From a paper:
The polymerase-associated factor 1 complex (PAF1C) is one of the most important transcription elongation factors that positively regulates genome-wide gene expression. In simple eukaryotes such as budding yeast, PAF1C contains five subunits: Paf1, Ctr9, Cdc73, Leo1 and Rtf1. PAF1C can regulate transcription through direct association with the polymerase or by impacting the chromatin structure epigenetically. The largest component, Ctr9, forms the backbone and shapes the overall architecture of the complex, while the other components join the complex mainly through associations with Ctr9.
In this study, we solved a high-resolution quaternary PAF1C of Ctr9-Paf1-Cdc73-Rtf1 from Saccharomyces eubayanus. The major body of Ctr9 folds into 21 tetratricopeptide repeats (TPRs) that wrap around the N-terminus of Paf1 to form a three-circled right-handed solenoid structure, with the Paf1 N-terminus just filling in the central tunnel of the Ctr9 solenoid. The rest of Paf1 extends out from the central tunnel and contacts the outer surface of Ctr9. Cdc73 and Rtf1 contact mainly the outer surface of Ctr9. Their interactions with Ctr9 were further strengthened by inserting a fragment into the groove of Ctr9 and making contacts with residues within the groove. Cdc73 without the α1 helix still formed a complex with the Ctr9-Paf1-Rtf1 ternary complex, while Cdc73 without α2 could no longer join the ternary complex, indicating that the hydrophobic contacts by the C-terminal α2 are critical for Cdc73 to associate with Ctr9. Rtf1 contacts Ctr9 spanning a region including the lower part of the N-terminal turn and the upper part of the middle turn of Ctr9. As Rtf1 and Cdc73 occupy different regions of Ctr9, they do not have direct interactions within this core structure. Residues 531 to 552 of Rtf1 form the bottom of the letter “U” that lie in the groove of Ctr9. In contrast, Rtf1 without the C-terminal tail or with only the C-terminal tail showed reduced binding to the ternary complex, indicating that the very C-terminus and the segment that binds within the groove of Ctr9 are two key segments important for Rtf1 to associate with PAF1C.
Residue numbers in the entry:
A (entry chain A): 164 to 207
B (entry chain C): 2 to 531, 536 to 663, 674 to 832, 849 to 865, 875 to 906
C (entry chain R): 502 to 570
D (entry chain P): 9 to 106
The structure:
Amino acid sequence: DPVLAETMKNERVVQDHNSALRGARPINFGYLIKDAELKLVQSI
Amino acid sequence: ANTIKVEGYPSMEWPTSLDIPLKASEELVGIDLETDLPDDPTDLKTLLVEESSEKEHWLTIALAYCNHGKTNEGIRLIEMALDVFQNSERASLHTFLTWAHLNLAKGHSLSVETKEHELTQAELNLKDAIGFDPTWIGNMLATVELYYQRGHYDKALETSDLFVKSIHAEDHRSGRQSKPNCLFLLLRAKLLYQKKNYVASLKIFQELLVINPVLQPDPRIGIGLCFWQLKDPKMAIKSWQRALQINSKNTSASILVLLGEFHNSLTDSTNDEVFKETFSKALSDLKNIFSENQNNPVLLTLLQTYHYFKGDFQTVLDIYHHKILKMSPLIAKTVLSESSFWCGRAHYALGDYRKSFIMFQESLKKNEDNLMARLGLGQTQIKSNLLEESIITFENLYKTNESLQELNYILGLLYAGKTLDVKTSKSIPAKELNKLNEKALQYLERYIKLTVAKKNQLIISRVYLVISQLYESQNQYKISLDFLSKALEEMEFVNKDEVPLEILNNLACYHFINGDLTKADNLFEQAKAKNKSVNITLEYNIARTSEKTNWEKSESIYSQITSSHPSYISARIRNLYIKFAHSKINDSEMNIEINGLLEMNKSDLEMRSFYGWYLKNSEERKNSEKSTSHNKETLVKYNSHDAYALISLANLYVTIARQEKSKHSYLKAIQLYQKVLQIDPFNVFAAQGVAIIFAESKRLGPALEILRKIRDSLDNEDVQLNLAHCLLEMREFGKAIENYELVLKKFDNERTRPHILNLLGRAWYSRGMKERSVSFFQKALENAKTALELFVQQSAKNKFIHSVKFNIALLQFQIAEDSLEGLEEGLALFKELNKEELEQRIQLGETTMKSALERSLNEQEEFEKD
Amino acid sequence: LKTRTKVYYQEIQKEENAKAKEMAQQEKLQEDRETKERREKELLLAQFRRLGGLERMIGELDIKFDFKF
Amino acid sequence: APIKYQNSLPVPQLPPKLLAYPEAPETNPDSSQLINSLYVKTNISNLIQQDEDLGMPVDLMKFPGLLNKLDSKLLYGFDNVKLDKDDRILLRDPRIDR
């Protein structure tokens, strides 16, 4: 399907499926790794 | 009228009649210099030799000859007096011959050999005259003028200053006052203009007006030149207009007025109506002035510009190669540079970039400050795949032309196109990539600043598109959308219908990303109105934009995309989903089709995601065997850190973790949560799984905080239900209940209304059990009733029917504390539920409760009586 | 150096400079205003003054030459 | 009801596709229209100087009495000329509209 190949070559992606996850707004969550690792290694 | 004539001003007009005395006193032979001049100077030479005529009569008649356009005839006539007058009487004759040969070497209707011959004859007669009378000002002025005409400008200035010094000294020695010599002042002002000292030359050219407003060479030409070079075109054009008004036969003044007409037509015009006639008058004047000055390089270059703007590129090349190139050594370097610039423009428009490069290079060789020629050279470098070379050219131009709007636009587009290239992202580190993006934004935003400051000029609408692309690459959707909108406005604020298809489509995609799909469908259809590829693309976009309203309008477009182009993966995924979630399918023909689509595009990831969602989310494949196998397969022997499938694996592994290997599985899930949080902190679902693990194992303090934060981005029913779960576990009811009604009004999920009503029974359990409450218990019971109804109606026969029924039984029992009627229904349902001790308690409690409630009711009726 | 030529030139220079500077000052504030600015928005929508318009307009011109080159 | 936390991943949301822009050769950096936009501003200035003589040829054949009667009186101008207003405005300094 060559016309479809032209379609594909003329198409950009606004959000791949990982980008789709985050939602309507962005929350930092950069502290979550630190706090989670600490609290769950205290239980370790 | 080759002489300045103004009412009230002096006049430097020659005696129009000369009468010669006859030898021995019949002293009236009239010779009228306009009319009675023989075309053969020998006829008057005989008269002059006969009557022993004076030397000045010879000179006077020869000057009258030369001032009528017959310089060769007068030259001959004085050359005939050279062998008559002899020995120091011929000094003034040599001065006249010097100046006449100087006049003959003035014009581009000449040759290099002819000009050299006339200049050499001039300086030869000058040597002869200096031999006799070296201090007569005619010879000194001829010296300085010869130096000027041979290009030796600072040497001429040196000798002119020395001559002025000597004259001042001689006059100061003899007590007489030195008046300014207008010719020395003129020469000095021209030499200073050559020195690029425009202010001093302007002052001299202005003082010459006061000393003599009739001076031919009109100083006004020079004051206009200096006004122009000092960035005052108005007064320059005014002075040239004055010079033409004073002598309508001055051709330099007319050509300057013509250039000024072109300039004013291009700048002062406020609309195309005024411009098309001002420029037309300029072109007609150009034609007329050209018809008798066909060797004029300025007029020829003007013709070149016109024919370029007319599309006649061959005539530009012809003017260059057939007129200018032949008289090339005789014309000034700047005019040559501009004509070569126009030849190069013609080459550039014809696609010949080698010749255009050569021509712009020649133009720069003749005038390095030819700004537009350097721009053409940079554009030729762009065309010749010399990108970095063009950027070097433009950035070197930027040091002096920092506020040039077109140059900022060019450099910004260049840097942006370099930034949006994949090769450069592969070749250089990321920080350099972002510095490049920043530099492109720098140039483009400075261009926008410069163009808005001059509120008369229109913005090139593309710069906003490029800024939006630059911000889009960095996932800053907000600024990109704002710049795309700003481009749409200005784009539609000129030519209201020709906006490119892609602007409305991409704006609609952005409006789909954030907010509802009302304007997105509008823009998608406006793009559909105005290429086979665009049809498929925006048809998928419209079908994807309707999945919330007229779901079945989406189904049809999806089918006909698949009914004619059965290889668009997104169309098939979304189609199977939409009609699946709209219930035009059974679980078997899903699998088949989905499996057909699964291992069709087996290897890569998007389809797989949908595959995972099928198994996990709704029908048959909840069994984890396939899930483990395939959601691992997404990561087996690939390096993919991708978030969806590995997060599914992690969280559905912690679902199994729900007992030393339980510790094992919990720490595995925590590990994977951290790992996926590393690559993307904004991954809301990883933080939500961490809130789950925090909330599950009795650390429901920070978990509620994390969930409260998560709801600021995610707004699904799932995470909010999770929120309301942790609040019931942690504390009292309103935080728990307040969120369950908000769950129900989040989505029309008929399965989660079941999911809601049992834990709603729990929520009203906890606080009617805090203390006896007879008004709240009944609405608790109502919610539990709706629970059991929703569980009996559906094809769901889980533990839910049993448990829902009991919770209602306990609600009935506690409400009996139309009271007896609910009590009887409670007895009935608890008998239907008939562990052992509980049902024997039920027997004794029926015996107690039915009678005791009848007692309470009769007591209540008796006290209602009174 | 106190000649009538120098002094005359300098005082005419002074007078014309003063006149022109004062005229430039009073131009934008008072001389031409009251919605004539928005007629200069017509100048904004000019074809010859925007991209590609110079050729187009010049193409529309009826006058042309009889070439000899 | 039991408590059971579910990190329900979203549906593989592939939103509408974007379209790349077509050719705009008039607005590319290699466009001659930029040079024409510049021409509208600085158009004919490299032409005001017509020759090295600056349009002001020195003749000496325009001063009566000079080249014939050896009377160099007209090279020193005239006395008490009262310039017209057009010639007097020309005497002012440049760029005075600032």
